[PDB]
């Protein structure tokens, strides 16, 4: 069981990604009860980062399953695969 | 051994959490030399995030031991157990 | 395999550090294609953080091999070894 944590804004919002049992899930704080978010992808290891633009939060989550890392992107309109490729 | 690193401000301040065995400890930098910080909790994995607000630094450390993640909170007055629960 | 991710600026720039076996490498995004970065050091675990000073982006990468964590620093002019020592 392994986590990654990000936050933004002054509320703040927090996201905690947990890799366990080959899956990565997402717990979210937006100022009230913690909740389970829409992020759900395969992986045994996770990292994440985020930034703000004028009218969106952008999240990049790096999900590693074995020898391959997949980037997952939030830009306000659902989770989409990113263009990241490894070395 | 596994680490998590955060930073804030212009100086900057940096905090590095290290899980070794089932203990997490904290090394700190505030602009001079590194020192050992007040954080000390159980865990074999760690992540962390931080933000500035309200004339304070807020840090959240997510410490996983025994299949369970505990959130530990610094808001200027000691490390306190947070509301976070997992999936 | 295990990763750490950081980001800055509006573009944004992203760096993803991957520990595979006992080597840490870096992939970079600055608004067009991903490319392989200058960072290359020993380690079985990586974390990272960054900040903007007025005049440059600063990155700190914490590379652990065994019971020892080394800090590597980017301050605009190559990677240098940081003062960080462990507990
Ligand atoms: C109260 C507090 O958190 N003090 C730390 C201080 O925080 C500042 C905020 O209060 C605020 O003014 O914003 C600025 C940044 O704009 C600071 O974040 O920051 C200084 C460094 O500039 C720290 O040295 C202070 O650290 C705490 O100091 C108190 C003094 O009573 C105690 O010694 C604490 O043990 C010490 O905490 C250390 O830092 C905190 C953030 C945790 O990592 C602790 O585990 C660690 O020991
Ligand atoms: C569009 C957007 O990014 N909205 C953010 C809010 O979170 C999403 O809200 C939509 C409805 O507008 C849904 O409820 C959605 O499930 C929420 O997504 C959650 O947060 C995002 C960032 C991801 O982490 C996702 O996996 C997760 O479920 C959010 O409540 C507020 C907080 O201020 O920000 C909005 O921008
Ligand atoms: C939102 C925030 O940062 N608030 C800080 C306080 O933490 C919250 O305090 C209330 C009671 O007043 C509840 O205990 C709540 O659970 C606390 O939330 C904590 O922080 C948020 C961001 C999440 O990480 C959550 O899981 C965690 O429990 C804190 O007590 C005061 C102390 O001065 O500072 C506030 O800024
Ligand atoms: C500071 C910064 O973001 N620079 C970006 C350029 O990156 C550096 O470019 C120089 C040539 O001018 C060198 O190729 C150097 O290796 C590049 O450094 C890269 O970024 C820094 C922050 C580290 O991560 C380092 O290991 C990595 O190689 C970049 O080439 C250009 C165009 O993509 O954009 C600049 O933002
Ligand atoms: C005075 C100061 O803060 N200097 C920063 C430069 O790095 C530090 O330089 C001093 C001078 O003795 C020490 O060598 C110090 O250990 C250096 O710190 C480095 O960076 C900090 C943030 C930590 O990561 C530390 O472990 C690391 O060694 C630094 O080169 C410049 C960057 O342009 O910033 C100076 O403020
Ligand atoms: C920050 C990057 O986000 C995505 O890349 C975006 C592209 O998919 C595309 O939307 C162009 C404009 O059309 O903008 C890019 O920023 C990811 O694919 C990429 O890996 C970065 O995370």
Short mmCIF file of C-alpha atoms and ligand atoms in Angstrom, two decimals:
data_model
loop_
_atom_site.label_atom_id
_atom_site.label_comp_id
_atom_site.label_asym_id
_atom_site.label_seq_id
_atom_site.Cartn_x
_atom_site.Cartn_y
_atom_site.Cartn_z
CA UNK A 1 0.00 0.00 0.00
CA UNK A 2 1.57 3.28 -1.25
CA UNK A 3 0.35 6.84 -1.48
CA UNK A 4 0.83 10.11 -3.27
CA UNK A 5 -0.64 13.43 -2.08
CA UNK A 6 -1.36 16.74 -3.75
CA UNK A 7 -3.20 19.89 -2.82
CA UNK A 8 -4.23 23.20 -4.24
CA UNK A 9 -5.95 26.46 -3.42
CA UNK A 10 -6.64 27.90 0.03
CA UNK A 11 -9.52 25.70 1.13
CA UNK A 12 -7.45 23.63 0.31
CA UNK A 13 -8.49 20.78 -1.95
CA UNK A 14 -6.46 17.61 -1.30
CA UNK A 15 -6.15 14.45 -3.32
CA UNK A 16 -4.56 11.25 -1.97
CA UNK A 17 -3.85 8.46 -4.48
CA UNK A 18 -3.34 4.98 -3.04
CA UNK A 19 -1.83 2.05 -4.95
CA UNK A 20 -2.91 -1.29 -3.48
CA UNK A 21 -3.74 -4.70 -4.93
CA UNK A 22 -2.80 -3.53 -8.47
CA UNK A 23 -5.25 -0.64 -8.44
CA UNK A 24 -4.92 3.04 -7.73
CA UNK A 25 -7.85 4.82 -6.08
CA UNK A 26 -8.36 8.45 -5.09
CA UNK A 27 -9.59 10.04 -1.82
CA UNK A 28 -10.60 13.71 -1.99
CA UNK A 29 -11.06 16.63 0.38
CA UNK A 30 -12.77 19.77 -0.82
CA UNK A 31 -13.56 21.33 2.60
CA UNK A 32 -16.08 18.83 3.91
CA UNK A 33 -16.21 15.02 4.27
CA UNK A 34 -13.49 13.00 2.56
CA UNK A 35 -14.89 11.16 -0.47
CA UNK A 36 -13.83 8.66 -3.09
CA UNK A 37 -13.10 10.33 -6.41
CA UNK A 38 -13.49 9.36 -10.02
CA UNK A 39 -9.81 8.32 -10.47
CA UNK A 40 -9.50 4.58 -10.90
CA UNK A 41 -6.68 2.98 -12.88
CA UNK A 42 -4.34 0.02 -12.75
CA UNK A 43 -0.94 0.28 -11.07
CA UNK A 44 1.32 -0.79 -8.22
CA UNK A 45 2.98 2.64 -7.82
CA UNK A 46 1.71 6.21 -8.08
CA UNK A 47 3.00 9.77 -8.11
CA UNK A 48 1.14 12.95 -8.83
CA UNK A 49 1.43 16.67 -9.35
CA UNK A 50 -0.95 19.50 -10.08
CA UNK A 51 -1.27 23.12 -11.09
CA UNK A 52 -3.91 25.76 -11.65
CA UNK A 53 -4.90 27.68 -14.75
CA UNK A 54 -7.33 30.61 -14.80
CA UNK A 55 -10.45 28.43 -14.70
CA UNK A 56 -9.36 24.83 -14.13
CA UNK A 57 -7.25 22.58 -11.87
CA UNK A 58 -4.95 20.25 -13.77
CA UNK A 59 -3.76 16.99 -12.28
CA UNK A 60 -1.23 14.55 -13.63
CA UNK A 61 -1.05 11.12 -12.07
CA UNK A 62 1.79 8.72 -13.02
CA UNK A 63 0.63 5.12 -12.67
CA UNK A 64 3.32 2.47 -12.90
CA UNK A 65 2.45 -1.18 -13.48
CA UNK A 66 5.56 -3.25 -13.77
CA UNK A 67 7.95 -1.67 -16.20
CA UNK A 68 5.56 0.85 -17.77
CA UNK A 69 4.40 4.26 -16.57
CA UNK A 70 1.13 5.71 -17.84
CA UNK A 71 0.20 9.34 -17.31
CA UNK A 72 -3.43 10.17 -16.48
CA UNK A 73 -4.71 13.72 -16.84
CA UNK A 74 -7.49 15.73 -15.24
CA UNK A 75 -8.17 19.07 -16.92
CA UNK A 76 -11.77 19.57 -15.79
CA UNK A 77 -13.46 17.17 -18.22
CA UNK A 78 -12.75 13.68 -16.98
CA UNK A 79 -9.64 11.58 -16.72
CA UNK A 80 -7.80 11.04 -20.03
CA UNK A 81 -4.55 9.27 -20.86
CA UNK A 82 -1.59 11.59 -21.34
CA UNK A 83 1.23 11.62 -23.86
CA UNK A 84 3.98 10.74 -21.35
CA UNK A 85 6.40 8.04 -22.43
CA UNK A 86 9.25 6.74 -20.35
CA UNK A 87 12.90 5.95 -20.78
CA UNK B 1 13.86 3.28 2.95
CA UNK B 2 11.36 5.57 1.27
CA UNK B 3 11.03 9.34 1.21
CA UNK B 4 8.58 12.19 0.58
CA UNK B 5 9.63 15.79 0.07
CA UNK B 6 7.81 19.08 0.30
CA UNK B 7 8.75 22.70 0.23
CA UNK B 8 7.31 26.17 0.65
CA UNK B 9 8.10 29.83 0.42
CA UNK B 10 10.97 31.72 -1.10
CA UNK B 11 13.79 30.65 1.28
CA UNK B 12 12.71 27.87 0.92
CA UNK B 13 11.71 25.64 3.78
CA UNK B 14 11.93 21.93 2.90
CA UNK B 15 10.74 18.87 4.81
CA UNK B 16 11.85 15.36 3.93
CA UNK B 17 9.98 12.44 5.50
CA UNK B 18 11.67 9.04 5.57
CA UNK B 19 9.95 5.72 6.24
CA UNK B 20 12.51 3.19 7.48
CA UNK B 21 11.23 -0.05 8.80
CA UNK B 22 7.93 0.89 10.34
CA UNK B 23 8.98 4.40 11.54
CA UNK B 24 8.68 7.77 9.75
CA UNK B 25 11.05 10.58 10.75
CA UNK B 26 11.50 14.14 9.46
CA UNK B 27 14.50 16.20 8.37
CA UNK B 28 14.06 19.92 8.04
CA UNK B 29 15.63 22.84 6.27
CA UNK B 30 14.66 26.47 6.99
CA UNK B 31 17.55 28.37 5.39
CA UNK B 32 20.61 27.27 7.40
CA UNK B 33 21.49 23.67 8.34
CA UNK B 34 19.38 20.52 8.27
CA UNK B 35 17.85 19.44 11.57
CA UNK B 36 15.69 16.61 12.83
CA UNK B 37 12.07 17.74 13.15
CA UNK B 38 9.32 17.00 15.60
CA UNK B 39 7.48 14.53 13.33
CA UNK B 40 7.76 10.93 14.42
CA UNK B 41 4.98 8.38 13.70
CA UNK B 42 4.54 4.73 12.69
CA UNK B 43 4.55 3.85 9.02
CA UNK B 44 6.31 2.00 6.28
CA UNK B 45 5.21 4.36 3.53
CA UNK B 46 4.82 8.09 3.45
CA UNK B 47 3.51 10.92 1.29
CA UNK B 48 2.99 14.55 2.09
CA UNK B 49 1.65 17.84 0.86
CA UNK B 50 1.54 21.39 2.18
CA UNK B 51 0.05 24.84 1.63
CA UNK B 52 0.29 28.32 3.18
CA UNK B 53 -2.72 30.16 4.53
CA UNK B 54 -3.91 32.14 7.49
CA UNK B 55 -0.34 33.21 8.43
CA UNK B 56 0.62 29.56 8.88
CA UNK B 57 2.15 26.59 7.13
CA UNK B 58 -0.08 23.53 6.95
CA UNK B 59 1.40 20.13 6.33
CA UNK B 60 -0.43 16.81 5.84
CA UNK B 61 1.59 13.62 6.10
CA UNK B 62 -0.08 10.38 5.05
CA UNK B 63 1.51 7.54 6.95
CA UNK B 64 0.62 3.98 6.03
CA UNK B 65 1.13 1.08 8.42
CA UNK B 66 -0.69 -2.20 8.74
CA UNK B 67 -2.93 -1.63 5.72
CA UNK B 68 -4.20 1.72 7.05
CA UNK B 69 -3.31 5.32 6.18
CA UNK B 70 -3.33 7.96 8.94
CA UNK B 71 -3.25 11.60 8.16
CA UNK B 72 -1.05 13.69 10.47
CA UNK B 73 -1.56 17.44 10.46
CA UNK B 74 0.74 20.34 11.25
CA UNK B 75 -1.07 23.70 11.44
CA UNK B 76 1.34 25.47 13.81
CA UNK B 77 0.46 23.79 17.13
CA UNK B 78 1.87 20.26 17.06
CA UNK B 79 1.13 17.22 14.97
CA UNK B 80 -2.50 16.13 15.26
CA UNK B 81 -4.48 13.22 13.82
CA UNK B 82 -6.53 14.27 10.79
CA UNK B 83 -9.98 13.26 9.54
CA UNK B 84 -8.68 11.34 6.53
CA UNK B 85 -9.91 7.84 6.02
CA UNK B 86 -9.12 5.55 3.14
CA UNK B 87 -11.23 3.66 0.65
CA UNK C 1 9.66 0.81 -10.70
CA UNK C 2 8.81 3.95 -8.74
CA UNK C 3 8.27 7.57 -9.66
CA UNK C 4 8.20 11.12 -8.37
CA UNK C 5 6.62 14.04 -10.19
CA UNK C 6 6.94 17.81 -10.02
CA UNK C 7 5.63 20.74 -12.01
CA UNK C 8 5.89 24.47 -12.29
CA UNK C 9 4.79 27.48 -14.23
CA UNK C 10 1.85 28.04 -16.53
CA UNK C 11 2.96 25.89 -19.51
CA UNK C 12 3.60 23.92 -17.35
CA UNK C 13 6.94 22.27 -17.08
CA UNK C 14 6.84 18.76 -15.63
CA UNK C 15 9.61 16.48 -14.45
CA UNK C 16 9.08 12.80 -13.68
CA UNK C 17 11.86 10.89 -11.89
CA UNK C 18 11.88 7.09 -12.17
CA UNK C 19 13.80 4.70 -10.01
CA UNK C 20 14.28 1.40 -11.76
CA UNK C 21 16.57 -1.12 -10.14
CA UNK C 22 19.23 1.12 -8.69
CA UNK C 23 19.14 3.94 -11.24
CA UNK C 24 17.12 7.15 -11.28
CA UNK C 25 16.44 8.92 -14.61
CA UNK C 26 14.36 11.94 -15.57
CA UNK C 27 11.75 12.69 -18.25
CA UNK C 28 10.90 16.25 -19.02
CA UNK C 29 8.00 18.20 -20.49
CA UNK C 30 8.22 21.90 -21.34
CA UNK C 31 5.14 22.33 -23.57
CA UNK C 32 5.77 20.17 -26.61
CA UNK C 33 7.38 16.71 -26.49
CA UNK C 34 8.66 14.64 -23.61
CA UNK C 35 12.44 14.32 -23.56
CA UNK C 36 15.15 12.74 -21.46
CA UNK C 37 16.63 15.00 -18.85
CA UNK C 38 20.11 15.61 -17.56
CA UNK C 39 19.44 13.97 -14.18
CA UNK C 40 21.10 10.56 -13.78
CA UNK C 41 22.13 9.19 -10.36
CA UNK C 42 22.09 5.98 -8.29
CA UNK C 43 19.09 5.14 -6.13
CA UNK C 44 16.29 2.65 -5.45
CA UNK C 45 13.81 5.32 -4.29
CA UNK C 46 13.18 8.93 -5.36
CA UNK C 47 11.20 11.91 -4.12
CA UNK C 48 11.36 15.49 -5.37
CA UNK C 49 10.19 19.00 -4.80
CA UNK C 50 10.64 22.33 -6.50
CA UNK C 51 10.13 25.99 -6.13
CA UNK C 52 10.51 29.22 -7.99
CA UNK C 53 12.81 31.90 -6.63
CA UNK C 54 12.47 35.24 -8.34
CA UNK C 55 15.07 34.43 -10.96
CA UNK C 56 15.14 30.60 -11.45
CA UNK C 57 13.36 27.23 -10.92
CA UNK C 58 15.02 25.14 -8.19
CA UNK C 59 14.61 21.38 -7.95
CA UNK C 60 15.62 19.03 -5.14
CA UNK C 61 15.73 15.32 -5.76
CA UNK C 62 16.14 12.91 -2.86
CA UNK C 63 17.75 9.70 -4.08
CA UNK C 64 17.96 6.83 -1.62
CA UNK C 65 20.31 3.85 -2.00
CA UNK C 66 20.10 1.50 0.94
CA UNK C 67 20.15 3.33 4.19
CA UNK C 68 21.37 6.58 2.67
CA UNK C 69 19.60 9.51 1.09
CA UNK C 70 21.40 11.96 -1.15
CA UNK C 71 19.98 15.32 -2.18
CA UNK C 72 20.76 16.49 -5.70
CA UNK C 73 20.14 20.13 -6.57
CA UNK C 74 19.21 21.94 -9.78
CA UNK C 75 19.58 25.73 -9.51
CA UNK C 76 19.93 26.61 -13.21
CA UNK C 77 23.50 25.45 -13.94
CA UNK C 78 23.60 21.65 -13.62
CA UNK C 79 23.06 19.09 -10.87
CA UNK C 80 25.06 19.56 -7.65
CA UNK C 81 25.13 17.62 -4.37
CA UNK C 82 23.07 19.09 -1.52
CA UNK C 83 23.89 19.40 2.17
CA UNK C 84 21.05 17.02 3.14
CA UNK C 85 22.00 14.19 5.45
CA UNK C 86 19.70 11.75 7.16
CA UNK C 87 18.77 11.10 10.72
C1 LIG D 1 4.56 27.60 14.22
C2 LIG D 1 5.33 27.05 13.05
O1 LIG D 1 4.82 26.25 12.27
N1 LIG D 1 6.57 27.48 12.94
C3 LIG D 1 7.48 27.20 11.83
C4 LIG D 1 7.49 28.42 10.88
O2 LIG D 1 6.23 28.52 10.25
C5 LIG D 1 6.01 29.79 9.61
C6 LIG D 1 4.51 30.07 9.75
O3 LIG D 1 4.17 30.32 11.11
C7 LIG D 1 4.30 31.26 8.83
O4 LIG D 1 4.62 32.50 9.47
O5 LIG D 1 4.59 31.18 7.43
C8 LIG D 1 6.01 30.98 7.28
C9 LIG D 1 6.32 30.79 5.79
O6 LIG D 1 5.81 31.96 5.08
C10 LIG D 1 6.51 29.79 8.13
O7 LIG D 1 6.06 28.60 7.47
O8 LIG D 1 8.46 28.25 9.87
C11 LIG D 1 9.74 28.27 10.42
C12 LIG D 1 10.71 28.37 9.25
O9 LIG D 1 10.60 29.67 8.64
C13 LIG D 1 9.91 26.98 11.23
O10 LIG D 1 11.21 26.92 11.79
C14 LIG D 1 8.88 26.89 12.36
O11 LIG D 1 9.04 25.54 12.84
C15 LIG D 1 8.41 25.26 14.06
O12 LIG D 1 8.79 26.19 15.04
C16 LIG D 1 8.17 25.98 16.27
C17 LIG D 1 8.55 27.15 17.15
O13 LIG D 1 7.85 27.02 18.37
C18 LIG D 1 8.64 24.63 16.82
O14 LIG D 1 10.02 24.74 17.16
C19 LIG D 1 8.40 23.52 15.81
O15 LIG D 1 9.00 22.27 16.17
C20 LIG D 1 8.94 23.89 14.45
O16 LIG D 1 8.38 22.93 13.60
C21 LIG D 1 9.18 22.42 12.51
O17 LIG D 1 8.55 22.83 11.34
C22 LIG D 1 7.16 22.41 11.23
C23 LIG D 1 6.57 22.97 9.95
C24 LIG D 1 7.10 20.86 11.26
O18 LIG D 1 7.83 20.36 10.13
C25 LIG D 1 7.71 20.35 12.53
O19 LIG D 1 7.71 18.91 12.64
C26 LIG D 1 9.16 20.90 12.63
O20 LIG D 1 9.78 20.50 13.85
C1 LIG D 2 -14.55 20.17 -13.22
C2 LIG D 2 -13.77 20.13 -11.95
O1 LIG D 2 -12.54 19.95 -12.01
N1 LIG D 2 -14.48 20.31 -10.82
C3 LIG D 2 -13.84 20.37 -9.51
C4 LIG D 2 -14.63 19.65 -8.43
O2 LIG D 2 -14.55 18.23 -8.53
C5 LIG D 2 -15.32 17.61 -9.54
O3 LIG D 2 -16.63 18.14 -9.60
C6 LIG D 2 -17.41 17.52 -10.60
C7 LIG D 2 -18.73 18.25 -10.78
O4 LIG D 2 -18.45 19.55 -11.22
C8 LIG D 2 -17.68 16.10 -10.11
O5 LIG D 2 -18.34 16.14 -8.85
C9 LIG D 2 -16.36 15.37 -10.00
O6 LIG D 2 -16.46 14.04 -9.55
C10 LIG D 2 -15.35 16.13 -9.15
O7 LIG D 2 -14.10 15.52 -9.41
C11 LIG D 2 -13.20 15.35 -8.31
O8 LIG D 2 -12.14 16.24 -8.32
C12 LIG D 2 -11.34 16.20 -9.48
C13 LIG D 2 -10.31 17.34 -9.41
C14 LIG D 2 -10.66 14.85 -9.59
O9 LIG D 2 -9.81 14.72 -8.46
C15 LIG D 2 -11.75 13.79 -9.65
O10 LIG D 2 -11.23 12.47 -9.75
C16 LIG D 2 -12.67 13.91 -8.42
O11 LIG D 2 -13.80 13.03 -8.46
C17 LIG D 2 -14.11 19.96 -7.02
O12 LIG D 2 -15.07 19.56 -6.07
C18 LIG D 2 -13.85 21.46 -6.88
C19 LIG D 2 -13.08 21.78 -5.61
O13 LIG D 2 -13.00 23.20 -5.50
O14 LIG D 2 -13.02 21.91 -7.91
C20 LIG D 2 -13.65 21.85 -9.17
O15 LIG D 2 -12.83 22.45 -10.13
C1 LIG D 3 -9.12 23.22 6.70
C2 LIG D 3 -7.94 23.42 7.62
O1 LIG D 3 -6.80 23.36 7.19
N1 LIG D 3 -8.23 23.68 8.89
C3 LIG D 3 -7.19 23.67 9.88
C4 LIG D 3 -7.77 22.88 11.04
O2 LIG D 3 -8.04 21.53 10.64
C5 LIG D 3 -9.46 21.20 10.64
O3 LIG D 3 -10.07 21.53 11.89
C6 LIG D 3 -11.43 21.18 12.06
C7 LIG D 3 -11.88 21.59 13.47
O4 LIG D 3 -11.82 22.99 13.53
C8 LIG D 3 -11.59 19.67 11.92
O5 LIG D 3 -10.81 19.05 12.91
C9 LIG D 3 -11.03 19.18 10.59
O6 LIG D 3 -11.06 17.76 10.53
C10 LIG D 3 -9.62 19.69 10.40
O7 LIG D 3 -9.33 19.36 9.06
C11 LIG D 3 -7.98 19.01 8.80
O8 LIG D 3 -7.44 19.69 7.72
C12 LIG D 3 -8.09 19.48 6.48
C13 LIG D 3 -7.38 20.29 5.39
C14 LIG D 3 -7.97 17.98 6.14
O9 LIG D 3 -6.59 17.63 6.05
C15 LIG D 3 -8.63 17.20 7.22
O10 LIG D 3 -8.64 15.80 6.97
C16 LIG D 3 -7.94 17.50 8.55
O11 LIG D 3 -8.61 16.88 9.61
C17 LIG D 3 -6.91 23.05 12.30
O12 LIG D 3 -7.51 22.39 13.41
C18 LIG D 3 -6.63 24.53 12.58
C19 LIG D 3 -5.74 24.73 13.80
O13 LIG D 3 -5.43 26.10 13.94
O14 LIG D 3 -6.03 25.10 11.43
C20 LIG D 3 -6.92 25.11 10.33
O15 LIG D 3 -6.37 25.92 9.30
C1 LIG D 4 15.15 25.74 -16.53
C2 LIG D 4 14.33 25.08 -17.61
O1 LIG D 4 13.17 24.69 -17.39
N1 LIG D 4 14.90 24.96 -18.80
C3 LIG D 4 14.18 24.35 -19.90
C4 LIG D 4 15.21 23.75 -20.81
O2 LIG D 4 15.82 22.77 -20.01
C5 LIG D 4 17.23 22.89 -19.97
O3 LIG D 4 17.72 23.28 -21.23
C6 LIG D 4 19.13 23.40 -21.26
C7 LIG D 4 19.53 24.04 -22.59
O4 LIG D 4 19.14 25.41 -22.55
C8 LIG D 4 19.77 22.03 -21.03
O5 LIG D 4 19.40 21.16 -22.07
C9 LIG D 4 19.27 21.45 -19.72
O6 LIG D 4 19.65 20.10 -19.56
C10 LIG D 4 17.76 21.50 -19.62
O7 LIG D 4 17.47 21.15 -18.28
C11 LIG D 4 16.27 20.40 -18.02
O8 LIG D 4 15.44 21.03 -17.08
C12 LIG D 4 16.04 21.26 -15.83
C13 LIG D 4 15.07 22.05 -14.99
C14 LIG D 4 16.39 19.90 -15.22
O9 LIG D 4 15.22 19.10 -15.05
C15 LIG D 4 17.39 19.20 -16.11
O10 LIG D 4 17.82 17.89 -15.63
C16 LIG D 4 16.72 19.05 -17.49
O11 LIG D 4 17.58 18.47 -18.44
C17 LIG D 4 14.49 23.09 -21.96
O12 LIG D 4 15.42 22.44 -22.81
C18 LIG D 4 13.70 24.18 -22.68
C19 LIG D 4 12.99 23.63 -23.92
O13 LIG D 4 12.37 22.41 -23.62
O14 LIG D 4 12.74 24.78 -21.81
C20 LIG D 4 13.26 25.32 -20.60
O15 LIG D 4 12.17 25.51 -19.72
C1 LIG D 5 22.49 30.85 1.98
C2 LIG D 5 21.62 29.96 1.14
O1 LIG D 5 20.50 29.64 1.55
N1 LIG D 5 22.14 29.55 -0.03
C3 LIG D 5 21.38 28.90 -1.10
C4 LIG D 5 22.31 28.04 -1.97
O2 LIG D 5 22.53 26.78 -1.39
C5 LIG D 5 23.03 26.88 -0.08
O3 LIG D 5 24.24 27.64 0.03
C6 LIG D 5 24.76 27.62 1.37
C7 LIG D 5 26.00 28.50 1.52
O4 LIG D 5 26.82 27.92 2.52
C8 LIG D 5 25.01 26.18 1.80
O5 LIG D 5 26.03 25.65 0.96
C9 LIG D 5 23.70 25.38 1.69
O6 LIG D 5 23.85 24.05 2.17
C10 LIG D 5 23.19 25.41 0.26
O7 LIG D 5 21.87 24.89 0.20
C11 LIG D 5 21.39 24.08 -0.87
O8 LIG D 5 20.04 24.40 -1.16
C12 LIG D 5 19.17 24.36 -0.02
C13 LIG D 5 17.79 24.86 -0.37
C14 LIG D 5 19.13 22.93 0.49
O9 LIG D 5 18.56 22.13 -0.55
C15 LIG D 5 20.54 22.51 0.87
O10 LIG D 5 20.62 21.17 1.33
C16 LIG D 5 21.44 22.64 -0.38
O11 LIG D 5 22.78 22.30 -0.03
C17 LIG D 5 21.75 27.68 -3.34
O12 LIG D 5 22.76 27.14 -4.18
C18 LIG D 5 21.10 28.89 -4.00
C19 LIG D 5 20.46 28.46 -5.30
O13 LIG D 5 20.59 29.47 -6.25
O14 LIG D 5 20.12 29.40 -3.10
C20 LIG D 5 20.73 29.98 -1.96
O15 LIG D 5 19.75 30.69 -1.23
C1 LIG D 6 0.77 19.08 -19.60
C2 LIG D 6 0.53 18.08 -20.72
O1 LIG D 6 -0.88 17.80 -20.82
C3 LIG D 6 -1.17 16.99 -21.95
O2 LIG D 6 -0.75 17.59 -23.21
C4 LIG D 6 -1.63 18.51 -23.79
C5 LIG D 6 -1.92 17.90 -25.15
O3 LIG D 6 -2.62 16.70 -24.96
C6 LIG D 6 -2.77 18.84 -25.97
O4 LIG D 6 -3.95 19.10 -25.27
C7 LIG D 6 -2.02 20.16 -26.13
C8 LIG D 6 -2.87 21.16 -26.91
O5 LIG D 6 -3.68 20.43 -27.81
O6 LIG D 6 -1.70 20.67 -24.84
C9 LIG D 6 -0.86 19.80 -24.10
O7 LIG D 6 -0.44 20.45 -22.93
C10 LIG D 6 -0.43 15.66 -21.83
O8 LIG D 6 -0.61 14.88 -23.00
C11 LIG D 6 1.08 15.86 -21.64
O9 LIG D 6 1.77 14.63 -21.47
C12 LIG D 6 1.33 16.80 -20.48
O10 LIG D 6 0.87 16.26 -19.24
#
